[PDB]
Amino acid sequence: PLPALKLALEYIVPCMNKHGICVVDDFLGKETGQQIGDEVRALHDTGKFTDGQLVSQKSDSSKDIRGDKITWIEGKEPGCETIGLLMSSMDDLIRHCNGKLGSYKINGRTKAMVACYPGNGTGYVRHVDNPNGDGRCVTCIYYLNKDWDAKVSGGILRIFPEGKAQFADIEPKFDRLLFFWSDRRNPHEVQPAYATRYAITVWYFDADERARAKVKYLTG
Amino acid sequence: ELDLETLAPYIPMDGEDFQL
Ligand SMILES: O=C(O)CCC(=O)C(=O)O
Ligand SMILES: [Fe+3]
Numbered sequence: 296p297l298p299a300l301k302l303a304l305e306y307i308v309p310c311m312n313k314h315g316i317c318v319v320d321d322f323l324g325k326e327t328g329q330q331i332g333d334e335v336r337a338l339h340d341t342g343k344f345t346d347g348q349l350v351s352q353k354s355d356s357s358k359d360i361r362g363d364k365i366t367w368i369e370g371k372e373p374g375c376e377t378i379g380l381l382m383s384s385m386d387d388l389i390r391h392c393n394g395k396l397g398s399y400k401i402n403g404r405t406k407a408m409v410a411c412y413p414g415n416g417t418g419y420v421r422h423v424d425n426p427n428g429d430g431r432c433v434t435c436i437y438y439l440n441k442d443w444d445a446k447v448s449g450g451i452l453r454i455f456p457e458g459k460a461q462f463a464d465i466e467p468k469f470d471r472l473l474f475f476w477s478d479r480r481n482p483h484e485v486q487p488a489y490a491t492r493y494a495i496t497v498w499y500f501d502a503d504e505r506a507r508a509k510v511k512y513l514t515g
Numbered sequence: 516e517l518d519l520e521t522l523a524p525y526i527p528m529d530g531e532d533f534q535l
Contacts, residue, residue, distance in 0.1 A: 348525035351518060360522055369533075386535055403532045408524070419524075426519035429526065479519075496524075500532060512528040 296323050296384050303391035307474060311396055311433075315456050315476040316463050322437065322472040323384065330377040332439045335409055335493050337374060338366055344411055347419075350429065362417030363485075365410040368495075382407050382497060385435050385472070389499055397476075399432045399501040408496040412450060412488040419485035421455075424477040424498065430505025431477040431498040438467040438494050450488035454481050467492055 310317035344364035346357055370379030425431035445451050445466040452465040457480045475481045
């Protein structure tokens with residue numbers, strides 16, 4: 296990947312503060328991207344994926360909301376070394392953004408969500424990643440679909456940034472890295488996918504909001 | 516209005532979280 300300092304300070308930071316969405320294409324290069332693809336396909340082939348879940352579960356099936364199957368990756372697992380390198384490269388960019396992404400203080404993140412929409416028209420209805428203050432402030436997604444033709448296979452991530460005259464269509468392009476504010480400024484949907492679609496997400500936490508959310512959880 | 520947490524992608528609230 297490119298030098299983290301310049302990419303963070305001269306592109307990611309201004310793009311995020313002005314637009315709340317930032318696309319970095321050709322993030323890791325073809326070789327590393329293909330190694331990540333092989334690791335993800337191996338997770339898929341060995342039965343690691345389970346139905347994607349929601350923050351709050353009511354009467355409805357999760358599959359009426361999101362049709363993907365996922366697994367959580369810490370980064371040090373055998374067979375996930377290149378996913379780990381991806382996560383460390385994401386983290387390096389974020390660390391070089393310290394104190395420049397809005398008013399957030401980013402001290403931590405989730406594990407990586409490796410997610411697959413297995414074609415068949417699966418998608419994710421319009422939603423907000425963090426609508427009620429669970430600590431998530433930045434969503435970071437890496438796409439790894441070599442040969443994706445969105446005009447036939449669908450799977451576009453459509454974001455509706457608040458206050459803007461146009462929505463943002465993000466094709467799940469090979470080696471594309473995406474950042475966006477996780478809060479209600481960026482409702483978004485994964486449009487139906489007609490081929491197997493892979494992406495890896497980490498969510499970065501704002502320290503004070505995440506502390507408040509942990510307190511709420513630990514007190515009931 | 517709808518409780519948007521019913522559409523939001525789950526994350527663990529327990530355990531640590533990874534520290535940067
Ligand atoms: O894969 C994507 O483009 C977005 C997935 C998403 O919105 C989610 O899992 O919350
Ligand atoms: Fe989302």
